[PDB]
Design a protein around this ligand. Structure first.
Ligand SMILES: Cc1cc(N2CCOCC2)ccc1Nc1nc(NC2CCCCC2)c2[nH]cnc2n1
Length: 261
């Protein structure tokens, strides 16, 4: 088929995903270059919703300059009916890539962590705490991870789901405060999965015994032993249940694990 964004024309190759009321497509331009265009339908969007979108769109536009661990946004068209965003295309998101993976080259892993750490640090420098990080927020592109979203009334799924609640930090649960250390807990959980093949509370079906466990210090998390003692440490340092005890992004960047060898 086909479509138009700011005059320029793109032919559709396939849909990649859906959610909210928005599709993401892979597409080709006039020069046969490949891109990803996200379409959002605003016909049922309240004013709040709409401001949240203008808000992420602006933050993404801005943070482009500051890191290449953020997804490139090349162009966009915005009206009262719809938004189109022309973006750089990934090969696969990280949730899907980790679903269909048997085990991880410990090098690839350290390299991904480096990427995650850079990207999340970046949004923190600009005032943003994501507070709902999952692997699905990360997209793989030339062997690099790039962060896709930041915080909106936002939801995506390829064609796992959302809410999930295995990356959720204690303080987000006690809230019924949130801060940068919240993004360390979630990043820790992701790294734990990339390390032990599951998330720390993954094997607790009952959604409520899971929430109770996350906030309960007497419930101790198992950190089985491994050749990379450092990796074991980082994990213990990210998964402190008290934010004040938890390590920080600038500290993680200086940590032996991402620095040594
Ligand atoms: C081409 C491609 C295929 C996939 N999949 C490969 C098969 O497994 C699930 C979908 C995932 C991401 C991408 N590339 C790709 N994907 C995106 N995905 C969005 C839409 C659906 C869930 C992940 C978030 C992109 N957003 C901005 N630029 C993107 N570039």
């Amino acid at each position: 088929q086909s479509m138009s964004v700011k005059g320029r024309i793109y032919s559709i190759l396939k849909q990649i995903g859906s959610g909210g009321s928005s599709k993401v497509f892979q597409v080709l331009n006039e020069k046969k270059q490949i891109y990803a265009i996200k379409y959002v339908n605003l016909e049922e969007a309240d004013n709040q919703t709409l401001d949240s979108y203008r808000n992420e769109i602006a933050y993404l536009n801005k943070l482009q300059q500051h890191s290449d661990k953020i997804i490139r946004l090349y162009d966009y068209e915005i009206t009262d009916q719809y938004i189109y965003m022309v973006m750089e295309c990934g090969n696969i998101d990280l949730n899907s890539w980790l679903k269909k993976k048997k085990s991880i080259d410990p090098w690839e892993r350290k390299s991904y962590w480096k990427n995650m750490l850079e990207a999340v640090h970046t949004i923190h420098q600009h005032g943003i705490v994501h507070s709902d990080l999952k692997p699905a927020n990360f997209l793989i592109v030339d062997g690099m991870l790039k962060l896709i979203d930041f915080g909106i009334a936002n939801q995506m799924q390829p064609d796992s789901q959302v809410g999930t609640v295995n990356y959720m930090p204690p303080e987000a649960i006690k809230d019924m405060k949130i801060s940068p250390k919240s993004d360390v807990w979630s990043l820790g959980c992701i790294l734990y999965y990339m390390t032990y093949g599951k998330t720390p509370f993954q094997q607790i079906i009952n959604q409520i015994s899971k929430l109770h466990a996350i906030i309960d210090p007497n419930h101790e998390i198992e950190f089985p032993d491994i050749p990379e003692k450092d990796l074991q440490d980082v994990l213990k340092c990210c998964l402190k249940r008290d934010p004040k005890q938890r390590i920080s992004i600038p500290e993680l960047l200086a940590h032996p694990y991402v620095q040594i060898q």
